[PDB]
Amino acid sequence: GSSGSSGKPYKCPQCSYASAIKANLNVHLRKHTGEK
């Protein structure tokens, strides 16, 4: 196996999380911008 990285541009500023869609990162950040 010789594969590189995922190439996913939209990455979390707090996690190792990445996605191919800006709105998927937007939903992920709603958990970082507030709670309870």
Binding residues: 12, 15, 28, 32
Name which position in 9, 14, 20, 21 contacts Zn ion (CB under 5 A).
14
Name which position in 15, 20, 21, 27 contacts Zn ion (CB under 5 A).
15
* 28 Cβ contact partners less than 8 Å away, ≥ 6 residues apart: 12, 15, 17, 19
* d(C-alpha 1, C-alpha 28), whole Å: 30
The least distance separating Zn ion from the CB of residue 11, rounded to whole angstroms, comes to 9
Name which position in 10, 12, 18, 19 contacts Zn ion (CB under 5 A).
12
